[PDB]
Structures are given as structure tokens and as C-alpha cells.
Amino acid sequence: YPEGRPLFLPEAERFGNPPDLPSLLLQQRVIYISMPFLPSVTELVVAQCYYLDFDDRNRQRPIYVYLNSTGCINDKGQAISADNEFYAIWAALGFTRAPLYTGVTWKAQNQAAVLLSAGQKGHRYSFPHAKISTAPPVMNRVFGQAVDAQLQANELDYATKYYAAILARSTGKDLETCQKQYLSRKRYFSVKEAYEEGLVDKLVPGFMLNRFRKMQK
Amino acid sequence: SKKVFMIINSFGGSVGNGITVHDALQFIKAGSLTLALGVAASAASLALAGGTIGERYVTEGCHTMIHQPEGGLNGQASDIWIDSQEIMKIRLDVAEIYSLSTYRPRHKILRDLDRDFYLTAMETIYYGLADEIATNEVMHSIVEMTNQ
Amino acid sequence: KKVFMIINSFGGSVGNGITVHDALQFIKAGSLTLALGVAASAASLALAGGTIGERYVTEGCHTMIHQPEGGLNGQASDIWIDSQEIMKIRLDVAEIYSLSTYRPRHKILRDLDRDFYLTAMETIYYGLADEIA
Amino acid sequence: PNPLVIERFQGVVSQLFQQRIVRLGGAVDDDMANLLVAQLLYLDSVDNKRDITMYVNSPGGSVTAGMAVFDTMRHIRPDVSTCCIGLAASMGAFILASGQAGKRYSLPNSRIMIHQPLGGAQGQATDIEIQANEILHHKLTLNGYLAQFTGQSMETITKDTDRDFFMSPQEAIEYGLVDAIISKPQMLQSREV
Amino acid sequence: DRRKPPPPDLPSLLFDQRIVYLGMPLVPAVTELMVAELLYLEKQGATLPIEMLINSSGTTRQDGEILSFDSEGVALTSTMGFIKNPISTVNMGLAVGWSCVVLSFGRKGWRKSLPHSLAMIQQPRVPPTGQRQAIEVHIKWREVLDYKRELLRMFSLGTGLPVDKLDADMQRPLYMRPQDALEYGIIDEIIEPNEDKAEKAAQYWIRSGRAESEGRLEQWQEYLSLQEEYALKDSFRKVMTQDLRAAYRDTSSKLLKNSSRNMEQVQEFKERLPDDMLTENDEVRLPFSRDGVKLAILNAECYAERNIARQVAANKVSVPDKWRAAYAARPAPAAPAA
Amino acid sequence: SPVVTPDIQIGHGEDAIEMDLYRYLLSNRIIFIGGYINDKMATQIVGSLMALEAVDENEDIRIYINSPGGQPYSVLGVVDAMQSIKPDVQTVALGACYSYASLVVAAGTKGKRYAMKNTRLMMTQPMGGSQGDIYQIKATVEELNALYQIFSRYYMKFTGMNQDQIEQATCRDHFMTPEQAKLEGLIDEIIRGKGDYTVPPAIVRQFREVGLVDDLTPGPFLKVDCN
Amino acid sequence: PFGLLLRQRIVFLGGEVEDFGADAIISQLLLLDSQDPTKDIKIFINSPGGSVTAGMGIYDAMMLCRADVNTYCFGLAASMGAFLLGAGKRGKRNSMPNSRIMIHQPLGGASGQAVDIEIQAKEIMYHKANLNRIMADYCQQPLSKIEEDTDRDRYMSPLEAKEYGLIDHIIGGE
Amino acid sequence: PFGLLLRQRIVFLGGEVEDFGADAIISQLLLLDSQDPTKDIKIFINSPGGSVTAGMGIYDAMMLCRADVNTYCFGLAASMGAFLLGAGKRGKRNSMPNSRIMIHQPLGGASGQAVDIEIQAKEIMYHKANLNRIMADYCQQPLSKIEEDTDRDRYMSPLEAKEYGLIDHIIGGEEAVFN
Amino acid sequence: CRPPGQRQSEWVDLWEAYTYQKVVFIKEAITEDVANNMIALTLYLDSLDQKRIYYWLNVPGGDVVPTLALYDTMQYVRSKTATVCYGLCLGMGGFLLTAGGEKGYRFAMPHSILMMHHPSGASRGQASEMHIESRELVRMRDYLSLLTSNATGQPYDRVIRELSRNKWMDPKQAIEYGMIDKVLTTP
């Protein structure tokens, strides 16, 4: 009969620390993705941004998104998922009034890479030894007629048109420029030349080399 | 709590499960607000049509896939004739839901149900499966009414 | 005080039916055995192991009565030793039923030769139950 | 098993071609039906008047594989004498009923089993009702052909063909599957007085 | 509110409102919970109603997979007869096998169902024996006969139909519609949708204008035009086969035989005139079709495009290339070709 | 045959033993098509067509077809090789034909396309599967449109119908009886028995579409009103 | 191999008799009828069992032979060879003195629909009534003595098989 | 059968190209050249693919043949048969009027050590570079245009194969070719 | 045994409620993983108090090496033990009946199926190491027979001849053989 109201950081500091490691990250407004885009793991990330926009007091703290996944395309090349699952991710992440600080640990294979540039400009954090890859997506095993391959070609037509619209807003290029540079062939990007291209801006905050700390001593 | 909010994001399953979620949303006295994310398959678009008319929201990246349900099994000669009349009756049963909620004629539903028909965000509003394009404001009022 | 359990089993070894048989007589108080649906050979030992006068059965319940089954493979000598095992287990469960049905033992071995099924009517006549619930 | 049984079985089948006897054995498949079509047109070439004693012993098979076996017997010039040894199936007793009237024989301890053809349907919703029309095309033609062979009506055939129905050789004379029974005369057994 | 804790999850919330949810198929793991759920509600009062939701495929899967036996469905209906409180069951979607038997075993007058639910009854499935002996097959067939007669017994008390009627329809899997289950005896009334939701949805398409501005008027006109062209097509198919039967009766009138009076002596003696018999043979009268309707006016179609044929008269001796059969066939004055 | 298929052959002579069944039938200008039409047996039918071409250039080479389907390019190689030889080819349809074996019996010469009474024919659009990236999806739909445009004008040359009748028939799964395929122009002569003139249920449905049979007068046909 | 004895009117019922295994023997039984309908035909039985619908095709094909039928058991006759051992002509059925003879009801399986159990139980009862009539014919035994012995597995020596009626003379001496 | 075409010097290349099926065609090709070095050899190619190692041995066997060779394409020619199609003598290259021609690079898998990967990476590039410069000789095409057409995984109708330079003549008078 | 019970005021599981009541239940077979939980449970009850421990067995068989781990913990502890039989103890489970409680503390149900046989093993490879594992299986065979001879009072030469083959006992013969002490009645 009483309402189950949630508690936040100005209120739940007297109730102790959270017991489990995803619940420490949920209190710190940090979402760590260590799994590719499965239908089981996409339901929790929708409820996570729904919880962060549920009863937040200020609604202005930046949400840190750490991504480490293959997206929907595995290392062998086939599609373990489809590209329509990413449309539920960007529509739910960009709904909140809070800015989206995006970071990458190791890899972002053709679905997490377009989410890497989709964050707030001026705060794209990245590790200095990560790998970034932008390739056009593929489809799973579909057995149909001649008109069935045409409608599947229209689904990948909207995939390249939606992915280039995100890269045109991030990198500041045209619509046809991002299709020729990124979404044509399976290429890879390092950390240094991606800053000149416009994928990332800086490194992670508080980064310092252990050898550079010995030079200060 | 006079309105419920259920996010629809699934690849669909059997057509018998999509009938139950559509009949349950049209039975309760409270309002039913349905929002889709990703796609709406044959088991998911019945929950999209199961909501009340006026508050069916879809985003710009949202798609909609309508198709006839599959099935079939192995048996005797006359056993296949019984269930083939049932699949043709279920295909007419889902055509009654799409003709009532979207105000489309019955002969034009079965033409689009004959093949795997995909819809964009623009033509879903023009067909009648949804009401308007979702944005930030249509869901900002959702998360603030459920706090009290 | 009085234990009340639901009897429902369609399979299983009869060796586990002897474990639940002696556990029911270990209780000092009475026992209420109410069978529902199917009663296998492991389930009928718990049905007959209850107190006389409190074994209920429904109109649609059935009781499966059959001999023990086993799987034997190996050397020639231990098959003959295990052949006497399945024989005296079948003679043991005949003496378990004989304490309740008040029948001679040679007629129960003829019913234990093949599979024997009973409806709700002749279960009362054969003494596995008491009345119809 | 071992090919020595296959080599000694290949010899006695090769002697059956000299006595104008063909062999229908095992399940009716697509490859075995093509081996039996080519062996029927060759026996007509050496003589177009002598009959062919068809050996029928099959526990089942495909429906469209036996359809090529059926119509190739009605158009050839001599009649085909069909005999039932061991067991007849739904595609086996249809070969038994397709013989010439007055020359269909059987043994008194063989089993004649008839039912509707099996199968299945899988695919889209339009693929279900189309594939259901294929089995009903196989259901109505086998019931239409059996009404002309046995002489019975249409409604009494489908009331027995819809389920698995076994038949005795004593009742097959009264029903119309086989015409006569070939058997040796019995011994003069004395009664118990 | 402070002394009573809230329910932790969703099945505990429906348990507090006395609602039993059968959402899982009939496995032996779920049947031991339902005999513990119904026996617990009997100890809390034998007068309070029990809400029951049915959503399962029964003891077997819908594709034909055998996961359990039909005997666990017998023990589920035995607790419904042992209990002594009114039970209101609601069918939710699928109901195959023993799931509709517990739907029909509820109290008469409270059996509810959705308008688009699925109901089906069929014969129980039998697992294979694995090439055992001969005499065990007869005992296994007796196990089928005791379980089939027990299924017809529990199905007769819930509906009211006799045993011989219910056994013939159970040989084939017969699916039941919610409109068909009223006259069959499965349910008692149909759960209606919300009338407040129906009038608010109908008023929204008129005020917003989406029922006419998005091209619905041109497509609903084609639905009535295709139904008009389909009603014109079968009417032309019916008048052509009526002229074939009228020409068949005209050609049969030029016959001189006594085969019709032989069937009159062996049949009944009352109806010596053409009249009704109140049976299967409903003889239609096709020349008695003088309508004279002055409302069905013909359209703007001229029939002057019909060519002129030879118009061979009836008194001709020309016979086609056929086998000879004129043994007793005398030449008619209206048909000399016989 | 569930376990094994024995060698059903006959070779008998007063002095020497002859060959087996398929070798003797190949010497009499008769080719058999059985099983799945893959790339392996496609060289067997084309290679035997070139073997009997060098023997005689005027005798009619006969091909017996009994296959439930096959590879779409392997069944394409036997048609155009059959149309690029000197003598005429008499085709005989055996068993069933599922969208590829119905093409080779329609690819015979006019007046020599013989089908039996209980033969099943079928005509559909070719199938296929999508693979990977959009540069191969667009290559896939351009391949399925190429296979549909080639097989469209094959039936226009051998049957003489219109392209609208082919698109309405090959849209879904359409099974044709030889009595119906004789009207479409796929075959030339129907093979019957000793006065066998039974009506298949596809023509009873065709008689119901034109209005010759009703439910009151079913005639001497099979029952069809059990729908 | 076996071709040297096939010309000497000897057949071998070896291995498990399946639907194809029974087809090889009953095809040979009519070739020896076509070669000579006067000379004797000897059948050597060594089988561990088989189905009833395949082993019934060997009995009527053996009874179709107008000549004399000799049946000799070599080794094991488990539930199928014991029926064919007595099915020969009286005075010619023999067996080795150290062979095992097992008589049993014919095996069968039942699956599918519940209405198939109506049909599968009837063919078992028809095969039981058919085999018990034949086994009581050449053995000169009443029907009450046959049914109480074939209900379970029953191994027997050729000593008591002589007085039963399966064999006629012992060929191995004692 | 196949032996009747062998004495008339006509061989068949059917099915998937393997290592066991490679040397069977090479062993019978040198036997026809030793019997008659003046009579032409007609081949028939129907292959849905194959290995680049065993497929080059068929090309070296036709170059080792002193007599002229004639090719015929029926059925399929996918990434290995189209290379063996144009590799014959110019002016004696015929095919079916509806056969398909696929010009695409061969495939390959790589696994193992880090030094092991870069060896087979440049090996399949050297196989890609050698297959491009060999097929550009008998086609009379520039190298930059023929190296990008093999990257597109699209089949080729025999109508546009004639002016491309891969084939010379079409059996059927060049009117039966359907688009 | 899946629904839990109560100890005095809160919900505790059924096997752990008897752990506080100093009753040990063994229902599954003796494997390596369940023997790690049994010998850790014997040391836990020995550290709390010093009373008699009750063991109820349902072992249908098991391995040799984890069974000797549970046998040696019975003699190491300073408390007393008592083994009570219900159901069946087959293989090495019947040896644990004669582990402790020799002075009138071996009880059994009147329908318990007993089983005694020599242990077994399997280890292949080199022929030189086959001699070493054969010496280990021989030294495990006679040592398991020496403990059954001292607990039951049987001569050592009779256990080698009888338990090498298959041997089964009813509770009527288990009294005269010295394998059990008393038979449990109806109360």
C-alpha cells in the first residue's frame, strides 16, 4: 500500500554501499557494456536510462557510457543480431536531458562505433590503444524469392542512411561523404588519426603514464 | 495509475501469444499507452493495435513488419486439411484486428499480409498502426506522472 | 499431528517405494493417503502403507500393479546372484500387500506376473483403498 | 550387411527375369521406382503377350514414387498378375489393386494394410493450404481408383481409408482387393471322432 | 500498511487476490503446485470464489511433442471435484487437450472466455513402447481405454453431451471458436471489451479526420466494388447451370419408358404426387421460377452481337459417331435419332 | 528401400553375358534422370547426349525424367544443350516435377512431349538466399531477377502463352495436372490406360469455376464439396 | 561360399530376419520350386529373432512348396526359428542335440495416435490367434497347453522338444 | 558414356574442383597430345568453384598441350571455370547462349602464428596479382579495368561477355541470349 | 525435501534443521563433491559440542577414494557416532554402516537391502605403471576386508572368499553376521 519510491545519491548515502558491482556503477550513473547486443542485455539498458530519468533531482549530470562489444556483427562476419536493435538504444539514450559522455575500452564493431561519435561533442573519451571499426552491416540467413531480396535491400538502405546521418552530425561532413569514407568497406581506425578524422576528441580523464610519473619523481 | 506504459521491443513469436496481449489491453478499465522501439512483428503489432487510439507513439528509427503466421506439422492426409482451415481462419482473425484498429478494408489487409511487408516511421502513421511520431516530450510526461 | 500427502506417480523404480513405505510406519500417529490420477508401483506401496480406514481414492484414479524391473549385464556369476535379488524383492512386495488385503499370497503372485490395473470400483474390493472420496 | 548376401540375392533376382517375374521390395523410393519402370518396359520387348508375375512386398514408401509405378502397368499391352507375399502397405496394396481383374492372387496368411497417405506441411500461411491441396489430390485419386477396382461406392472407401485398416485374405475376396487365392490342397486330416 | 508487507513479485500479487494463473504447460512439476494452491484456498474458506486463468497447450505440445501423459490431467480435475467452493475460470488464449477440460469443469454460469481465444479437444497421445512383448500391448491398450473413457466422463459432466456423440468428434482434432463454444457447452458467456474504450476510439477517428483524409474512402469503395463484382460473378454461374438442368429436363421429356413406375411400387405409397418428404432429399422445382420482378432492371448492355447459327430442327435422323445401342430405343416423334 | 537397394539388372546370352540395366538402356538411346539434379549428374545427362550424338544424327534421343527438383544452373545446362543438337528429342515425364523437372519436359520438340496420367508438374519463381553485405544483397536481387527473366521467356517459346499468365502462375506454388498442362501448352499428348478417362479433382474444381457441376447434381465425378 | 550350396538345394536363414532379410530367403524358396518341384529342400535356421510381419512371409512360402520340406536347426532359434522348425513336414524336422530352442509370442510395437492402438492391439491378437492355431496343428497339443507355454520366454532342449512336436528324430545321437 | 567421349578426345570438367579431381584431367590431357598433336581437344567446364592451387594446374596443362584446345561452358562457371574459359585458343571459344560467367577472386582462410598470417596474406595477394595479369592477356583489356571488375561479385551474361574479350563465339547465332 | 522448515523461530532448510539437531542425512551417491561437504560437516559438529552423531544413508553405490575420506573422519573425531539404515546401502555405502557405533549403535529398517562386495578401479596406460596401480588396488582390497572383519567379528579368511563375488543381505541375516546391531520396530 505505500509507494516504493527510489532513493538517490543525496538520500541513499546513509543506507550503505551497494553490494554488487553493476549496482555500484548504476549509482555512479555509469553503464558498462561488456556483452554484444543480445535481446537479453538490451532490456536492462532501457530500464537503466528509465531509472536515471525516474526521480533524479537535478537531471543534469553527464551519463558515462562505456562500451566494449561487437555490436551485432561478430569476428567471423555473420550477423548474431540485426541492426534494428540499435535503433532502440539511440532512441532511449538520447531521450534524457542529461548529456551523454561516451567512452570506449577496446573495440566498437560497426554498431558501437557510431554510438561512440553520437555522444556530447568535446568529451569523447577513449583509451590510447583501442581499435575502432566502421563497416556497413550485414543481414542474417534469409531464404526468399526475388521480391524478398528487394525488401531486405531496403532495410540495409535505411541502415546506411541512418548511420551516415549520425556521422554527419558528429564529424561535420556531408551525407554522401560518410557513406564513401566509413560505410563502404570493412576498415579499421586507430586512436591518433581518429582525432584528426573526428571520431574521438580526448583521452580518459585522469590518464597518466606510469613512466611519466617516474619522470616527475 | 489510470494509464499503463509497456515498451514494445521484440522480434515476435507465435501468433497465439499476440492475441492474448491484444485482448487483455482492450479489457481493463484503465488506459493503455503503447510505445514501440525497434520493430513490431506479428506478435508485437497486435499489442501496438491493442492500445487505445490516440496515444500510440513510434520513433523515427522505428520500423513495422507485418506478415502472415507460419506453422504446420506432419500427420495423416485429412489431418492437414483440418489445420490448414485453421491457419486460414487465424489469418482472417488477425485481419479483423487490423481492419478495426486501422480502419482499412478487409481486402487490402490480406494483400499486405500475403508477403513480408515492412513499414517505415512515415508510412506507419499513414497506414493507421500508430498515431503520431514520438519525440522527447511525449515520454517526458510519462516518467513524471508515474512518480506519484 | 496427522500427516496428509498427495499420491501422484506414473513411473520410477520400486526400490524407492520401499523407502517411503517404512518411513510411513515410523510415524507414531496416523496417516492419510489420498491418491490422485495415476498410482504406479512405487506409489501403490505408499498407498497400501497407510493406516487402515484412512486411505481415500477418487472416482477417476487408477492403480498400477506390476513386478519389479531391472537391468543386468556383466559376468556369468553375479547375474545368478542378482536373479535371486529381483525374485525376493517381488516376494517382499507381495508380503507388503498381503498385510492389508488379507488375501492368500499365491493369488497375488499371479496378479504380479503381468501389468495389473484397477479402476475405482475394484480397488475397494482388492483392499488397496477404503472408500470413494 | 555383408555384400555376400547381396551377391547371392542379385543372382536369384537375375533368374527371375527369365521367368518374367519382377520384384517390388522395400520402401518405395524415387530411385527404386526408376529401377522398376525400366524393368517393366524390357519384359514387353521380348514378348508382348505373356503376363508378368509382379512380386509385391513393401512396408511403405513415398506417394509420388508409387504413382509412376501405377500408370505404367495399365498402358502396356500384356496384363500384369500381382501377388501379395508377406505384407501390403498403402503404396503396396495400391499396386495389388492395380492388377488385372481375375488374375489378382494372394496367400492366406499375408496382411493387407490400407490407409490414407501420410506427409506434412511446413512454410508460410499460403504454403500450408497449397501443400494441403497436394495431399488431398493424393487422397481423392486413391479413393477414386479403389472404387473402380473393388466396385464399391465412394463414401464407403473413405470411411475405411481415413484410418489404418488391416485386411484378411478371407475377407479380401468379399471386399475386392484380390480375386483368388493360390494355395496347395490340404492334407486329409482325420478328425478327433 | 506498515504491518502488512507488500507482495515481492507478480505471482504473489495475484495469489493475494485469489487468482490462480495456469500459464505453464502441464508438466509434473506444475501439477504439484496446483494441488497445493487449491488445497490452500479451501482451508482459507469454502465460500470465497476462485479466479482461474487458462493458458497452456495441455499435456502435449502443439507440434506433437509428447512431454507427459494424459493421466496428470485426470488428477487436476479431481481436485476441482473434491473442493466445495464456486470456481470462476477464464480462458486466456490457447486451450488444447486437458486445459479445456478444466475450463469446462468449472461452475455453470461463470465459465468465461475471450472473443478471440483458441479451444481444442483431441485424443490423448501415447509414447512408443520400444519393441516389447505381445501381451503388454493389450494391457497398454486397456490403459488407453480406461483413460479415454475417463476423459469422456469428465467432458460429459461439464457440457451435457452424451458419450457416443463426444467420442465421434474426438477422433479428429476439432478446433472450437468462442462463437462455437456457446452451442457446444464449453463456456457460458463471452467476455466483452470495454464499452468506454469502444466509444472513445470511434469518436477519435471522426474528430481527427483520419478515417477519411488518408485515402480510406477510395479503398473502402473498392471493397464494396469488388464485393459487387464477386456477387455478379456467381450469379452468372448459377443461371448457366440452371439452364443446363432446364435443358436436361427438356431432353428427358422425350422418353417412352416405364422405369419411373417401378420405383413407385417398391417405395412408400403416400406421396404419389411431387411433394415434400422432410428428409435429406429436398427436391427443387426449377421451372417454377416465374419471378416477374419489375425492379431488377437490365443495364446498358445490348444483345445484338449474337450471331446466327444453323438452328437444326428436332425432327432429324442424323446420329453422331457412337456405338450402336438401338435395340429397344424406338425413334421418338420429337427425337427420331433416339 | 530403407537399408540397401540391390542391383536390378538383367544380362543373359547363350554365349556371353551382357551389361546391366542402365548401360543397356543407354545403348538404345534412352536416358534416365533420377534423384537430385546437382552438378555431378548434370555432366552425366549432357555427356550421354553427346555420346548418342556421335552414334547417329537422325534417330530420336529419348530422355526419361523423374526428379523432385535440382540445382537451377545445373538444370539450365541441360536445356540449352538439348536445343543445340541436330535430331529431335522425345521427352517422357515420370513421377513428379517440381519447378525444374517441369522445364525439361516442356523443352522437348513440339509433338513429342508425352506426359502420363498421374504425373505432377509445378512452375514457380526460383528461390535463393541473401548473403552478407549490401554489395552482395544487390548482387543477389540482380541474380534472382536474372534467373526469373531467363525462365520467363523459356515458357514463351515452348508454350506460346502471354507473360501475364506466367506471372500469375509462378507467383505462388502452383501444381498443374497434365489435363491442365495440355491447355497451357507444356505437353502435347496425354498418356492413358485401356480406356482410362478418370477426372482428377483439379478439373472438378475447374468445372465448378465455369458452372458445369453443382452440389445438387454432382454427376459421375468424385466428391469435392467437403471443403 | 553360399553359391556352392545353393545349387545343392540348401538355403540359409542366417542373421536377424528383417524386411529385406526375409525377402532374400522367400525369393530363393520359389526358385528351388521352379528348378525341381520333386527333390527335397533343406532349410538351415540360425536367427536371433525378428519381426512377425517378415517372418510370416517365410511360413506361407514354405507351405507353398509342393515338394518335401526338411528343416534343420543349427544353433539359436529365438522366437522365430522355433515356429519355422515345426512348420516343416512331419518326419523330417530335426535338430542338433546341443541347440537352444526358444518359443515366445511374436513381438510388436505400438505408437502414433490413440486410434492406432485400436489397430495395433488387434493385429497382435490376430497374430497370436493365428500362430497358436498353427503350433497346435503339427504338435498334436490342445490350445490350453500352447498358450500357457508361449506367454513368456521358454528355452528348451531337444529332449523335451521331441515329445512336444517341434522335432521328429534326433540326428546327433544322444 | 564417358569412355565414348574419351576416344573422340572430349573430356569433362564437372563438379567442384578438388586436388583428387585436378590430376585426373591433367593425366588424360597429355595422353591426347601424345596420340595426336594436330587434332583439337574439346573440353566442357561446369564448376561452382575450386581451389586456386589445383585450378592453376589445369591452366598449365592446357598451355603444355601442343595441339589447340576448344572450350565449352555449360551450367556454371564460378571463379575458376571463367578463368579456364578464356584461357583457350582465341577464335575457338564457344559456350551455351544462357550460361553464367562469374569473375571473382578466390577465397581462403588464415590462422596460426603472427608471422604465419602475413605469409599467407601476401600469398593470396600474389595469387590475386597473378590471376589478374594472366587473364588480361587473352582479353585485350587494360590492367586497371580488369582488376576492379573481378572485385564485384556479380555474374555476367554471355551477351556482354563477347565485347569484353573473354569469349569469341556463342553457339546459337547470338539471338537466343536472354538478358 | 525442497520446502524448508523451522528451527525455533525462522525459516531454515530441512537438511540444515537436522544439522542443528545433530542428524546427518545422506541421500545421493558418494562422489568426490558430496564427500567434501560431509567431512567438513563432521568437523563442524565436533567443534561445537561432543555428542553422538546420527547418519541416515541412502547410498546406491559410489567410488572408493572419497568413501575412505568419510570413514577416517569417524575415528579421528573425539565424539561418538551411530549409523542408522533406511532404504538401501549398496557398494561402498554398506561399508559405512560398519564404520562406527559397534557397541550397539547400528540400526536398520526391517526392509533394508544390504550389499557387500570388493571395491574396484580403472587406470590404463604404461605396463610399468599398471603394476603399481595393481598393488594399490590389492592393498585397498585386503585393508577394506580387515575393517569388516574387526567390526562384524567375522573371520578374515571368510570375507575374502565371500565378498569377492556378489553378496546381498536381508536384515534377518545381518543380525547373525554382526553387520548391524538392532532392528528398528514400528515405533
DSSP for chain H? Answer: -HHHHHHTTEEEEES-B-HHHHHHHHHHHHHHHHH-SSS-EEEEEEES-B-HHHHHHHHHHHHH-SS-EEEEEEEEEBSSHHHHHHTS-TT-EEE-TT--EE---------S-HHHHHHHHHHHHHHHHHHHHHHTTTTT--HHHHHHHTTS--EE-TTHHHHHTS----TTTTSS---
Residues of chain G with C-beta less than 8 angstroms from the C-beta of E127: 111
Q: Which three cell numbers stand for residue E113?
A: 472466455
Interface contact flag, E194 B28, Cβ < 8 Å: yes
Contact H58, H25 (CB under 8 A): yes
Residues C100 and G122: their CA atoms lie apart, in Å, by 37
DSSP string, D9-41: HHHHHHHHTTTTEEEEESSB-HHHHHHHHHHHH
CATH of the domain at E62: 3.90.226.10
E134: domain range? Answer: 10-195
Nearest to G82 by CA among G57, G109, G108, G47: G47
Report the alpha-carbon distance of residue B102 to residue B109 in Å, rounded: 10
E185 close to B (CB below 8 A)? no
Q: Is there a domain that residue F219 lies in?
A: no
A204: nearest Cα among A105, A75, A99, A87: A105
Question: Distance (Å, rounded) from C-alpha I90 to C-alpha I117?
Answer: 9
Cβ atoms B61, A87 nearer than 8 A = yes
Cell of F90: 522425345
Q: What residues of chain G lie within 8 A of the CB of F2, using their CB?
A: 19-20
The Cα–Cα gap between F139 and H156 comes to 11
CB contact at 8 A, C92 and I111: yes
Report the DSSP beta bridge partners of residue G14.
G46
Query: Please, do chains C and F touch (3+ CB pairs < 8 Å)?
Result: no
E73: chain C residues, CB-CB within 8 Å: 37
Q: H25 and H46 in contact (C-beta within 8 Å)?
A: no
Residue A211 burial class via C-beta count within 10 angstroms: exposed 0-12, middle 13-18, buried 19 and up: exposed
d(C-alpha E145, C-alpha G114), whole Å: 9
- DSSP at C130: -
Q: Are F80 and H97 in contact (CB under 8 A)?
A: yes
Q: Is residue B46 packed enough to be buried (19+ CB in 10 Å), middle (13-18) or exposed (0-12)?
A: buried
Residue A102 · residue A124 · CB < 8 Å? yes
Contact B40, B8 (CB under 8 A): yes
Phi, psi of F24 (to 5 degrees): -70, -35
Give me the count of residues in chain E.
338
DSSP states of A25-71: HHHTTEEEE-S---TTTHHHHHHHHHHHTTS-SS--SPEEEEEEE-T
Q: Got the DSSP string for chain G?
A: --HHHHTTTEEEEES-B-TTHHHHHHHHHHHHHHH-SSS-EEEEEEES-B-HHHHHHHHHHHHT--S-EEEEEEEEEESSHHHHHHTS-TTT-EE-TT-EEEE-PPP----S-HHHHHHHHHHHHHHHHHHHHHHTTTT---HHHHHTTSSS-EEE-HHHHHHHTS-SEESS--
Residue E25: partners with Cβ closer than 8 Å, 6 or more residues away: E56, E57, E58, E59, E61, E67
Short-list C114, C108, C3, CA closest to C55: C3
Task: Enumerate the residues of chain G whose CB falls inside 8 A of the CB of residue E144.
Answer: 114, 117
Q: Which of H79, H95, H111, H169 is catalytic?
A: H79
The amino acid occupying position H24 is A
Please report the domains of chain A, with CATH numbers, ordered by start residue. Answer: 21-216 (3.90.226.10)
CA I55 to chain centre: 8
Instruction: Name the 3-class secondary structure at C106.
Output: helix
F114 within 8 A of F187, measured Cβ to Cβ: yes
DSSP state of E99: G
Chain F residues touching A144 at Cβ < 8 A: 127-130
Handedness of CA I147, I151, I154, I159 (dihedral sign): negative
**Rounded to a whole number, what is the largest CA-CA distance in chain D?**
72
Contact yes or no for C15/I88 (Cβ under 8 A): yes
Disruptive mutation site among A72, A156, A183, A186 for chain F (greatest number of F CBs within 10 Å) = A156
Spatial separation of the C-alpha atoms in residues C56 and E81, rounded to whole Å = 14
CA distance G153 to chain E (A): 10
What is the number of domains present in chain F?
Answer: 1
Are A96 and A133 a contacting pair, CB within 8 Å?
no
Specify which residues I183 forms β-bridges with.
I108
Find chains touching chain E: ≥3 CB pairs under 8 Å: A, B, C, F, G
Closest residue, chain E, to C115 (C-alpha): E139
Give which of G58, G152, G148, G143 is closest to G105, Cα–Cα: G152
Picking from E182, E50, E191, the residue whose alpha carbon sits closest to that of residue B24 is E191
Q: One-letter amino acid identity for B104? A: R
What is the rounded distance in angstroms from the CA atom of residue E105 to the CA atom of residue G139?
58
Q: Are F6 and D6 in contact (CB under 8 A)?
A: yes
CB contact A43 to F (< 8 Å):
no
Cα dist from E57 to B84, D120, E24, whole Å = 19, 21, 8
Q: Of F184, F80, F46, F123, nearest to H178 (Cα)?
A: F80
- Distance in angstroms (rounded) separating the CA atoms of residues E160 and E173: 20
The residue type of E265 is Q
Instruction: Please report which helix (H) or strand (E) contains residue C55, including its range.
Output: strand C55-57
Q: Is residue F7 part of a domain?
A: no
Complete domains list, chain H, with CATH: 2-164 (3.90.226.10)
Q: Which residues of G are catalytic?
A: 79, 104
Q: Angle of helix G21-35 relative to helix D3-16, nearest 10 degrees?
A: 40
Tally of domains in chain I: 1
Phi, psi of H38 (to 5 degrees): -110, -30
**CA D17, CA D51: separation in Å to the nearest integer?**
12
Nearest to E75 among C36, C117, C119 (CB): C36
- The domain that contains F52 carries what CATH number? 3.90.226.10
Describe the crossing of helices D125-150 and D63-74 by its angle, rounded to 10 degrees. 40
| Residue F118 belongs to domain spanning | 21-210
G60 vs D86: CA distance, rounded Å: 8
Closest CA to C40 of C64, C18, C57, C17: C64
Which amino acid is it at F206? Q
Task: From H63, H59, H83, select the one nearest H73 (Cα to Cα).
Answer: H83
- In angstroms, the Cα distances linking E27 to E59, E90, E123, I114 are 7, 21, 18, 35
How far apart CA C102 and CA C123 sit, in angstroms, is: 14
Give the orientation angle of helix C76-101 with respect to helix C41-48, to 10 degrees: 40
Q: State whether residue D153 sits within 8 Å of chain F by CB.
A: no
| 3-state helix vs strand vs coil in chain A, percent to 5 | 35, 15, 50
CA distance C124 to D5: 60
Q: Which residues form the domain of I26?
A: 1-187
H93 touches H168 (CB < 8 A): yes
